[PDB]
Amino acid sequence: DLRPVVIDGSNVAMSHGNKEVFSCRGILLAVNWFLERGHTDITVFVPSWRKEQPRPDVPITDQHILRELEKKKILVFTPSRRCYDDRFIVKLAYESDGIVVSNDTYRDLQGERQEWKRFIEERLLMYSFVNDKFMPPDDPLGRHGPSLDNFLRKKP
């Protein structure tokens, strides 16, 4: 069936929030795009501190969505205290032979291990939002690669 999907929650929320707000509806729209397609294996990573009441440098909307998705077994909180996130995203996707949903290419992680660098190159699903419309590319790896349909499948 379908490759495990790992979503960079902070990337997708900042993107939906136009780079200025952590818009939690962005995570929900992404998740729903996959759910609609029949994906059942979906993990969103978000840092646990995003549950905390917001400070002026970290504005956030629709915070209730993090809990809703945690209850559904879709969101997993990464540990934080007074960052860890990118490594969880990459390691989980790598280890579950899945795909990462993010516009972050994780340059630091690429430089740690060649096989992570190669993974990121073959398994990253970038995207744009137009308002609430979540738009992944139909050919995620140009034409050196599969359609979006085959990209998300374990096999064509």
From Swiss-Prot:
Residues 2-150 form the RNase NYN domain. Expressed in heart, placenta, spleen, kidney, liver and lung. Expressed in leukocytes. Expressed in monocyte. Oligomer. Found in a deubiquitination complex with TANK, USP10 and ZC3H12A; this complex inhibits genotoxic stress- or interleukin-1-beta-mediated NF-kappaB activation by promoting IKBKG or TRAF6 deubiquitination. Interacts with IKBKG; this interaction increases in response to DNA damage. Interacts with TANK; this interaction increases in response to DNA damage and serves as a bridge to anchor both TANK and USP10 into a deubiquitinating complex. Interacts with TRAF6; this interaction increases in response to DNA damage and is stimulated by TANK. (Microbial infection) Oligomerization is necessary for antiviral activity. The C3H1-type zinc finger domain and C-terminal region are necessary for pre-miRNA binding. The C-terminal region and proline-rich domain are necessary for oligomerization. (Microbial infection) The C3H1-type zinc finger domain is necessary for JEV and DEN viral RNA-binding and antiviral activity. It is linked to Increased expression of ZC3H12A is associated with ischemic heart disease. Endoribonuclease involved in various biological functions such as cellular inflammatory response and immune homeostasis, glial differentiation of neuroprogenitor cells, cell death of cardiomyocytes, adipogenesis and angiogenesis. Functions as an endoribonuclease involved in mRNA decay. Modulates the inflammatory response by promoting the degradation of a set of translationally active cytokine-induced inflammation-related mRNAs, such as IL6 and IL12B, during the early phase of inflammation. This is Endoribonuclease ZC3H12A. The gene is ZC3H12A.
